[PDB]
Structure formats: structure tokens, C-alpha cells
Amino acid sequence: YEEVSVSGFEEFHRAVEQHNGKTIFAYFTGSKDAGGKSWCPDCVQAEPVVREGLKHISEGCVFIYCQVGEKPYWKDPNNDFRKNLKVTAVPTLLKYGTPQKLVESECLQANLVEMLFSE
According to its UniProt record, which residues of this chain constitute the active site? Predict the structure, then answer.
């Protein structure tokens, strides 16, 4: 699998367009500041679980690690992630273009994560 790391909606949209013909999995998480501090506790706890699940991904897939921005931006009800992708909580693990998605505490359960990356 090939990983792509992006920050913000613009970069995300760009990344998906360049892989329009591949199975895409996207992980939406809070951004870390210059100091490396994360405002989303659940995101910090879930990342290692999601990445461990990557060992189960089927060949030929794409994984997009997406930092959505700072807390004030995420809280804005009009931000692009909420309005365009219907992502209303972080962390969120989504199989792009499909209904399969895991949210918040679901991202901490290895079984659920594995089942999403499997097929």
C-alpha cells in the first residue's frame, strides 16, 4: 500500500484526485502544532491502533493520513470536511466513496479496524 500525508481540505481533495482509480482509506485526525502538541486525545490513542491495522490492508490500496487542522477550525460548523465529506468527528477512519467508516472509540478496536482494512 502507498501512504499519503496531507493537511487541510485542499491538500486532501488533491490527493484523492491523483488516486481517483484506487481503493482509498482516509484517516481524519487533529493537527499537531509546531511544538508537536495534539488537541485531540482520542486521536493520539487511536493512531497506533489504526497503523497496526495497516498490516492487514489488501495490496493496491491507498492510505491518506489527513490532519484536519487546529481545534477552532474543526469546531467551525461550516468547515469543508463537515460540509463536503460529511466527516463530523475525529478520529474517523473512512473507506472513501463507500459507507464503511469507523468513528471515535470505534477506531480503538483492532477487530473493527482489521475488518475495514481487510476487504
Answer: 40, 43
Query: What sign does the CA torsion over 36, 38, 44, 50 have?
Result: negative
Q: Give CA–CA dist 41/51, Å, rounded.
A: 16
Calculate helix-pair angle for 41-53, 110-118, nearest 10 degrees.
50
> Which residue among the candidates 43, 61, 66, 107 is catalytic per the annotation?
43
Does 40 qualify as catalytic in the annotation? Answer: yes
Number of structural domains in the chain: 1
Experimental structure resolution, Å: 1.8
* CATH code for the domain in which residue 39 is found: 3.40.30.10
Region of residue 86 (left: phi > 0; alpha: psi -120 to 50; beta: else): left
> Which residue range is the domain that position 100 belongs to?
1-119
Is residue 43 among the annotated active site residues? yes
- Among residues 107, 105, 31, the alpha carbon closest in space to that of 68 is found at 31
